[PDB]
Amino acid sequence: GRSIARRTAVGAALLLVMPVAVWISGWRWQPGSWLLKAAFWVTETVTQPWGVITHLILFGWFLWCLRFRIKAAFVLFAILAAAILVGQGVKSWIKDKVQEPRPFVIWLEKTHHMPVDKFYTLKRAERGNLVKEQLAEPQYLRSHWQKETGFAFPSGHTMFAASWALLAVGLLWPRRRTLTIAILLVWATGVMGSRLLLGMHWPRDLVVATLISWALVAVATWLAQRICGPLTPPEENREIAQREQESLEHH
Ligand SMILES: CCCCCCCCCCCC[N+](C)(C)[O-]
CATH class of the missing domain: 1.20.144.10 (Phosphatidic acid phosphatase type 2/haloperoxidase)
Structure with a gap:
């Protein structure tokens, strides 16, 4: 049953x-x-x-x-x-309502010298495009982080x-x-x-x-x-x- x-x-x-x-x-x-x-x-x-x-x-x-x-x-x-x-x-x-970092994003903003205070003091979509650009500068893994997102979703x-x-x-x-x-x-x-x-x-x-x-x-x-x-x-x-x-x- x-x-x-x-x-x-x-x-x-x-x-x-x-x-x-x-x-x-x-x-x-x-x-x-x-x-x-x-x-x-x-x-x-x-x-x-x-x-x-x-x-x-x-x-x-x-x-x-x-x-x-x-x-x-x-x-x-x-x-x-x-x-x-x-x-x-x-x-x-x-x-829209995500606004949350993926484990790698934190290590990134850190490693790339990005004041967290300033990091979130900036916009919403611009943050994502900035993560994209920071990713631009292994390879396939990059392909995957880009393809997936900056923000963590379900x-x-x-x-x-x-x-x-x-x-x-x-x-x-x-x-x-x-x-x-x-x-x-x-x-x-x-x-x-x-x-x-x-x-x-x-x-x-x-x-x-x-x-x-x-x-x-x-x-x-x-x-x-x-x-x-x-x-x-x-x-x-x-x-x-x-x-x-x-x-x-x-x-
Ligand atoms: C990010 C991809 C969006 C997925 C949409 C929601 C998926 C739930 C479906 C789970 C069912 C899997 N199953 C049993 C059909 O194989």
Whole structure:
């Protein structure tokens, strides 16, 4: 019954573990040398460029594991899509009220001799264009800081990876390759870590995207299940049991 929502919850909490830990810890970012590249790979698996690859594969794969009760599965991926739309809607809509530095911006204004008092005594958009110019004077990492922003926004990356992971844990505990759960969990954590290491986000931001991710996934499961039909074990109790007893077979 409510079991999904239990697991989902637990999942959130689990994924809340690392960032709250970090958040409490007083850690700060600064230069290093090879980690940046791996973290950049991990974030690039969510960036779109590519993709859109991870996303589709996870989509279809989920649909396989989501068989039987697949009637709601599509509904589910529609709801998620809907909020996704809603998402890009709000994102693009307000870039006004942010006014917050990204971990690297602080180190920058410092390193570049920019009185913080004066730094915020200046405008709003001019600040951003100045961060752009200060960035202009590794390379790909610069490309990423430019492409992203001066101001820190919510974490899309976190939200996406975390929503996937949450979906994974929550709506399947009854096994289709539990490797999928463990992998989405570790991967999600890896994206969040990727954001931290790259001077992209403050730990609180990660915590919050994980929460948003939680609420989104929750509302989506409850609503998709409302109309019509849940998963729940599908007949697939017998089929999953049939795959379970195949584990001890050989003889
Ligand atoms: C900065 C990018 C804006 C993203 C818009 C909001 C995204 C929330 C969608 C999370 C759902 C991920 N999922 C489960 C469909 O894979």
